[PDB]
């Protein structure tokens, strides 16, 4: 399963620190050091298609893997004046499994590194290319009775009369089978459309056509009925063949244990209490601790 773009893992196995099949390395830099962990441990930073991997370069057991669908704030800090060269630093701020992590990567060699620009550029491409690798409902996929193609996408076939076995009135639609996703859009109300990428499709079969999607990012059961069963099985064949040829090398469309405690963005806190309503402020505020109050926390 694909996790290198979805999670933030610590002390990764040397087999998972290696390029996943669809992944490609983009850039690298040596002597990068790990701050927000005050071990002084030199290392090496690597920016890949889907994530940033830091490893100690002396004891590669201790290392970090941060996915791009987990980073919220990527900033560059150019500081550290004449005393030495400008040791540029990088500040990554992430939210994984409902917890805020903060990583500081300091380039010990005084030169300014070109890695910190490629990082942000590939992260921008990742965020702007999520139509390749995610499930989308009722989005803007059709200009005028015609699909809108991704950067790396070719439409393979276009089937008509494709009903949707999830509604009852807006059913008669069109089905585009591509090399990156299968989409269905209604004839009337062309804003009723679905787009399932092969990365999410887990099993295509007939039951009259059923797509079962990955339970790791929402397990949906999408059913479509076609009038001639011949075209039905033909489309099933095409879809499954495309799924397997995509599975061998994923595209991804990107154009170009207790150690985690030390990397808290908040600080000694990893879970937010339940948001309740505060009658004092008139806003939704997270549930207060036992003794504390709003006016006792506001004062200094």
């Amino acid at each position: 399963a694909l996790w290198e773009d979805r999670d933030v893992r610590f002390d990764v196995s040397s087999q998972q620190m290696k390029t996943r099949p669809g992944e490609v390395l983009i850039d690298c830099l040596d002597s990068v050091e790990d701050t927000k962990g005050n071990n002084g441990d030199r290392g090496r930073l690597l920016v890949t298609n889907l994530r940033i991997v830091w490893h100690s370069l002396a004891l590669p057991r201790v290392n970090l893997s941060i996915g791009y669908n987990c980073i919220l704030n990527i900033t560059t800090r150019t500081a550290n004046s004449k005393l030495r060269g400008q040791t540029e630093a990088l500040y990554v701020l992430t939210k994984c499994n409902s917890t805020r992590f903060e990583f500081i990567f300091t380039n010990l060699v005084p030169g300014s590194p070109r890695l910190y620009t490629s990082l942000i550029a590939v992260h921008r491409a990742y965020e702007t290319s999520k139509m390749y690798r995610d499930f989308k409902l009722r989005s803007a996929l059709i200009q005028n009775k015609q699909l809108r193609l991704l950067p790396q996408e070719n439409v393979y076939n276009k089937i008509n009369g494709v009903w949707n076995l999830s509604s009852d009135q807006g059913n008669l639609g069109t089905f585009f089978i591509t090399n990156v996703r299968i989409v269905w859009h209604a004839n009337m109300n062309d804003s009723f459309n679905v787009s399932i990428p092969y990365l999410q499709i887990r099993s295509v079969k007939i039951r009259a056509l059923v797509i079962e999607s990955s339970q790791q990012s929402g397990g949906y059961v999408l059913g479509f009925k076609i009038d001639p069963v011949e075209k039905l099985q033909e489309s099933v064949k095409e879809i499954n063949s495309l799924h397997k040829v995509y599975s061998a090398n994923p595209i991804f469309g990107v154009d170009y244990t207790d150690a985690f405690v030390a990397y808290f963005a908040d600080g000694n806190k990893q879970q937010d209490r339940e948001p309740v309503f505060s009658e004092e402020l008139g806003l939704a505020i997270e549930k207060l601790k036992d003794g504390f109050t709003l006016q006792g926390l506001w004062e200094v």
Partner: protein, 50 residues
């Protein structure tokens, strides 16, 4: 009008050696001396006596 205290001359050069600690290099300085000819600030004349 007056004559210089010495006909010497100095040429000083200052450069930077690029090293591993500092990529702008240690500053270093070396100098050389030359000796100008007496016939720049002098000519023959009538020799006085006392």
């Amino acid at each position: 009008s007056y004559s210089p205290p010495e006909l010497e001359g100095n040429a000083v050069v200052s450069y930077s050696r690029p090293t591993e600690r500092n990529p702008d290099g240690i500053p270093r300085v070396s100098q050389c001396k030359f000796r100008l000819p007496l016939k720049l600030v002098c000519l023959p004349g009538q020799p006085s006596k006392t």
